[PDB]
Amino acid sequence: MEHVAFGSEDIENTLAKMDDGQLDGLAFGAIQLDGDGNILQYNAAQGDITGRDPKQVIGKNFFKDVAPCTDSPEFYGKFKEGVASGNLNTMFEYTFDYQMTPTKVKVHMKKALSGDSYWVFVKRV
Ligand SMILES: *C(=O)/C=C/c1ccc(O)cc1
Numbered sequence: 001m002e003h004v005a006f007g008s009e010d011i012e013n014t015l016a017k018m019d020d021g022q023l024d025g026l027a028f029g030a031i032q033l034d035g036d037g038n039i040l041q042y043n044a045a046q047g048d049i050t051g052r053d054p055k056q057v058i059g060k061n062f063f064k065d066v067a068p069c070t071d072s073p074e075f076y077g078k079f080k081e082g083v084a085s086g087n088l089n090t091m092f093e094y095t096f097d098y099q100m101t102p103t104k105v106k107v108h109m110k111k112a113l114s115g116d117s118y119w120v121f122v123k124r125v
Contacts, residue, residue: 001025006123007091007108016113024054029105029122032112035083037063037076046122051100062120069098079109079118087111088118093125 002025004014015023015030020041023030029046031039038061042054052066060066063076070076075094082088091108108121 001027006106006121011121012110012113012119015119027123029120031062031120031122033062033079033118033120035116035118037061037079039066040117049103049105049122049124050096067096067098069096070094075107082109082111083118 002018002022004011004026006028008014020043023041024044026043026045029049030041030043031046032041034040039057039059042052042057044054046052047054057066063071063079074092078090078092079088082090088109088111090110091106094105094107096103096105104125105122106125108119110119110121111117112119
């Protein structure tokens with residue numbers, strides 16, 4: 001697989017070189033969002049955690065359509081503030097519970113190297 005550790009300091013540089021196939025080799029879930037919250041990339045490990053089919057969620061809005069349980073000041077609110085400010089680096093635990101067994105995860109959101117792109121990284125806890 002692709003050897004990159006969750007929470008690594010330079011993760012956005014390392015992931016800038018990966019196509020969708022290489023992203024599927026990561027040990028943790030990875031979602032790339034645009035500044036409106038639309039899903040641009042969604043890897044295999046994320047689909048294993050959540051049950052979603054990675055090919056079908058691309059193009060959907062994460063906060064409106066896919067993950068309403070994240071539409072809250074504690075998750076979406078942090079994303080919105082990061083987009084508005086142009087910088088974002090925050091890690092926190094959360095529970096995903098929409099149409100699935102409630103699953104506790106650690107989330108790391110970080111601005112990507114590309115201009116209007118943001119990463120959401122997820123692992124089980
Ligand atoms: C709450 O509704 C969270 C649901 C969710 C989180 C992450 C995903 O990749 C998919 C659904």
